[PDB]
Structure formats: structure tokens, C-alpha cells
């Protein structure tokens, strides 16, 4: 004990940061291969480590298009999050004037918060995850084919090729694990590249709805 806990911390940090890399934010290559002993060097053993503050991270920005667009990652400590803690996060958010942040829960939170997660503000969006999910990166799994989100121009071109109206495309559920991983809202279109049994390849498209 305190070595399994640190192992979990290491793995969840790896996964969250990989997710942020995949969404296209600033991240440094030397962090990617941060080893568990490297984590032990940067962060001490569990009894000396303050969970709700040690792992918080906000260096990530949307450098791909806007270095001035920053985001947050938070690691609450209480088994179930309460209204006070999300208010503390949101007021910290207002002090830093940022629009997006990530939430991780060890077990869950109050239903009152669940209701609140839909109505913070149109300009403030908060995404909820569970510790027992990000402990593995679903994108690395063998049954998950490569998803690649694509811009408005690419979709324009695609549905110009087949003479489609966008609603004739097959759907991907808004709440699906991979869609929620990539953080794509309604009306976006995703390209799937399926691995054939042979060297060939098949392509298909789905609409987020």
C-alpha cells in the first residue's frame, strides 16, 4: 500500500496527459515517457503527497490554433464531490478566466452536482470522468479502430462527393466513450479507419448525434 496508490496516480496522469496530447494541446515529449520511478522522484510517497493539489495541471493550452486558450485539470479528493468544491473550482476558473476544465472522481458525487453539470454556463463547460475508466486509455485497445475528427471543409467535401444530406450518415452516440474521450459536441463528423483482415483498409463516416 502506497505503492499501488502511486501506481494508480502514475497511470491516470499518463492517460490524462495522453488524452490532452490527442486533443492537440501543448505537451512536451520528455513528459510522455515519464516513468513510474520518475514520478516517484518528482512526487513522494502517498502519506507525504497531497492528492487534491499535487496533481493539478493547467500548463496545457490549445497551441495548435490558440496559445492564449488554456484549460484545467483537477483531481478532487473526496469520494463524492459536493456543491462547495465545484463552486471552488468555478471561482478559481473565473479568477483565471478559462472556459474548460476536466473532472475526475474516485467514486462519484452527489446527484445535485449531476444536475448542475448541465447548467454552469454556456461559456463554461466541465467534463466528468471516473477514475476506473482513465486507468486505461481506450484508444490503445485492439477492438477500437482509429477515430479521426475532421474539419468543416472535409465534411463539406465528403458530402459533396456522395450527394448526401448530412443527416443520411450513420450516427455515433454523443455520450459514447470514444466520442467523450475526444470531447466532440453534436454536429461534428468522425472518420473511422477499420483494420482489414488483410493489408487492405476500409473507411467509414459517422455523425455525432
Amino acid at each position: 500500500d502506497d505503492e499501488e496508490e502511486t501506481y494508480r496516480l502514475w497511470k491516470i496522469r499518463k492517460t490524462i496527459m495522453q488524452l490532452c496530447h490527442d486533443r492537440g494541446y501543448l505537451v512536451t515529449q520528455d513528459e510522455l515517457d515519464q516513468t513510474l520511478e520518475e514520478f516517484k522522484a518528482q512526487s513522494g510517497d502517498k502519506p507525504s503527497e497531497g492528492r487534491p493539489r499535487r496533481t493539478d495541471l493547467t500548463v496545457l493550452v490549445a497551441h495548435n490554433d490558440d496559445p492564449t486558450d488554456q484549460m484545467f485539470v483537477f483531481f478532487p479528493e473526496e469520494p463524492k464531490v459536493g456543491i462547495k468544491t465545484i463552486k471552488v473550482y468555478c471561482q478559481r476558473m473565473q479568477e483565471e478566466n478559462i472556459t474548460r476544465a476536466l473532472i475526475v472522481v474516485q467514486q462519484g458525487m452527489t446527484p445535485s452536482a449531476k444536475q448542475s453539470l448541465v447548467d454552469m454556463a454556456p461559456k463554461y463547460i466541465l467534463e466528468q470522468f471516473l477514475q476506473q475508466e482513465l486507468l486505461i486509455n481506450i484508444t490503445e485497445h485492439e477492438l477500437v479502430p482509429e477515430h479521426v475528427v475532421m474539419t468543416k471543409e472535409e465534411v463539406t467535401e465528403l458530402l459533396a462527393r456522395y450527394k448526401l444530406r448530412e443527416n443520411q450518415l450513420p450516427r455515433i452516440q454523443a455520450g459514447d466513450p470514444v466520442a467523450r474521450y475526444f470531447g466532440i459536441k453534436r454536429g461534428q463528423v468522425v472518420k473511422i479507419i477499420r483494420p482489414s483482415e488483410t493489408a487492405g483498409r476500409y473507411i467509414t463516416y459517422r455523425l455525432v448525434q
Binding site: 443527416n167 443520411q168 450518415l169 450513420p170 477499420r194 482489414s196 473507411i203 467509414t204 463516416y205
Partner: peptide
């Protein structure tokens, strides 16, 4: 008129 597959059976 909604698509089920883009090509029958991939081939």
C-alpha cells in the same frame, strides 16, 4: 434513403 454501408461488404 439513409446509408447502411458505403460499399457492400467492404469489397
Amino acid at each position: 434513403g439513409d446509408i447502411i454501408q458505403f460499399i457492400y461488404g467492404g469489397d
